[PDB]
Amino acid sequence: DVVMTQTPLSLPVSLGDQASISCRSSQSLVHSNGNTYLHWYLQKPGQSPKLLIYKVSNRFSGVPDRFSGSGSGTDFTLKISRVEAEDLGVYFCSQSTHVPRTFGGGTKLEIKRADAAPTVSIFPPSSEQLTSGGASVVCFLNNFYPKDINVKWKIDGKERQNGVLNSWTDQNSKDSTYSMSSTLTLTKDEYERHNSYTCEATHKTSTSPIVKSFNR
Amino acid sequence: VQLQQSGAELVKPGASVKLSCKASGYTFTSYWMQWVKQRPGQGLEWIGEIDPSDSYTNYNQKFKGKATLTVDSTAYMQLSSLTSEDSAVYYCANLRGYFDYWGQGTTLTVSSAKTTPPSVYPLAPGSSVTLGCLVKGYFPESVTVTWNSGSLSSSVHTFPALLQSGLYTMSSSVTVPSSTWPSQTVTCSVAHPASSTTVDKKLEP
Numbered sequence: 413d414v415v416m417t418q419t420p421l422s423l424p425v426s427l428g429d430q431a432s433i434s435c436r437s438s439q440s441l442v443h444s445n446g447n448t449y450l451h452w453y454l455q456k457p458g459q460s461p462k463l464l465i466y467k468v469s470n471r472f473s474g475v476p477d478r479f480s481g482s483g484s485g486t487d488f489t490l491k492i493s494r495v496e497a498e499d500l501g502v503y504f505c506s507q508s509t510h511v512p513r514t515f516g517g518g519t520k521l522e523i524k525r526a527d528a529a530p531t532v533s534i535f536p537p538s539s540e541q542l543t544s545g546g547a548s549v550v551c552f553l554n555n556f557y558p559k560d561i562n563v564k565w566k567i568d569g570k571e572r573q574n575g576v577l578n579s580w581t582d583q584n585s586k587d588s589t590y591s592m593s594s595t596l597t598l599t600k601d602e603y604e605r606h607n608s609y610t611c612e613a614t615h616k617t618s619t620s621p622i623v624k625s626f627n628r
Numbered sequence: 629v630q631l632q633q634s635g636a637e638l639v640k641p642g643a644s645v646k647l648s649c650k651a652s653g654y655t656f657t658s659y660w661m662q663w664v665k666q667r668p669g670q671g672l673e674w675i676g677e678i679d680p681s682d683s684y685t686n687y688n689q690k691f692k693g694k695a696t697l698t699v700d701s702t703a704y705m706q707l708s709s710l711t712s713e714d715s716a717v718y719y720c721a722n723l724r725g726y727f728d729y730w731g732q733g734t735t736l737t738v739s740s741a742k743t744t745p746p747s748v749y750p751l752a753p754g755s756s757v758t759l760g761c762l763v764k765g766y767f768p769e770s771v772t773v774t775w776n777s778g779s780l781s782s783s784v785h786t787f788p789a790l791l792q793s794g795l796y797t798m799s800s801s802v803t804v805p806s807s808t809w810p811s812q813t814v815t816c817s818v819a820h821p822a823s824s825t826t827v828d829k830k831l832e833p
């Protein structure tokens with residue numbers, strides 16, 4: 413099996429700039445028939461991979477010429493001349509000179525953009541959920557950049573560490589920002605014993621923590 | 629060309645599964661059908677190919693013991709003696725030069741856990757109001773949340789599911805102009821195919 417190694421694993425790049433993605437094979441991809449079957453795919457989250465370039469530099473139907481492929485033997489380059497928001501995703505190089513067909517590890521294109529502070533929203537457990545004895549209090553930290561953020565839950569001033577669940581979205585294909593939802597899970601009983609529930613976030617954009625709160 | 633693929637399958641360890649690929653938009657017989665495997669956060673693995681004019685079949689050694697390719701304009705692939713390492717998305721695809729067409733893939737979950745429908749809870753509380761729906765306690769994965777049957781898509785954020793006590797839980801949020809809610813109602817729709825579930829939740833203050 414030919415091993416394909418891509419460089420790099422993550423590539424941060426501003427809009428309008430240029431991106432170069434590399435791919436090496438453990439051995440020559442030149443078929444005895446003359447052709448070099450090296451290809452490039454783009455996989456956008458939740459979608460099947462889509463072909464960009466086949467046989468090093470020919471473009472599939474509809475692919476624009478901002479994308480070009482180059483290289484030979486064992487070294488190959490995929491070039492994106494002017495990165496656009498919709499280019500984010502993972503790029504895979506694949507070869508079919510040798511059997512079995514093989515793929516690279518993938519390179520995730522990350523868009524660099526201007527810092528954006530998160531817009532925080534706090535929500536109390538719905539009556540429907542209370543009704544069944546559960547009590548999840550949720551926090552949405554929307555549209556921020558960079559992705560590095562920190563969230564703390566405080567109940568009456570006390571910081572609650574256990575029972576919290578955090579999930580981030582992938583970079584937004586439209587504005588290049590990130591989002592995250594932090595959920596604090598308690599029983600109806602514990603919840604009803606206190607008064608204020610605080611969602612605190614510390615992100616590059618503030619110095620002073622961003623705080624959203626609600627008093628039951 | 630279009631290659632229609634199942635979508636999801638939940639199977640018990642040790643059992644066998646048979647996935648299907650429905651080919652259209654081209655002469656089925658003209659191209660060799662392929663199969664690729666992709667595990668959640670990793671790269672891709674090639675499995676094998678079959679020729680529709682006859683049934684000559686080639687496989688990668690790693691899957692010699694797991695896959696049995698057959699055809700019909702439906703191409704089939706059968707895995708066997710499944711384990712949690714088989715939990716992955718499988719794609720059927722025509723991979724030949726510029727004739728490159730993939731199917732949407734079938735998310736295959738190998739687990740003993742029982743299919744559990746989700747409980748949907750509405751999340752209600754400037755110039756914009758962010759509303760949401762908490763979808764919790766479901767299995768297997770694969771849930772689609774849409775706002776106003778999908779006509780409200782501009783400000784929607786879908787947060788990936790997480791395991792909380794052997795059961796998944798995720799959320800979705802939508803942001804609308806403040807003056808429009810509660811004047812107009814926004815309702816999130818949650819579909820969980822695996823358990824034939826489609827529950828709508830109206831967001832009220």
Ligand SMILES: O=c1[nH]cnc2c1ncn2[C@H]1C[C@H](O)[C@@H](COP(=O)(O)O)O1
Nearest residue numbers: 443445447449507508509510723724725
């Ligand atoms: O991906 C592939 N890997 C190896 N050989 C191929 C593949 N596709 C086509 N070929 C073959 C089949 C042909 O006789 C020949 C030239 O066809 P072409 O599709 O132009 O590369 O090489």
Ligand SMILES: [Zn+2]
Nearest residue numbers: 568605606607
């Ligand atoms: Zn208290």
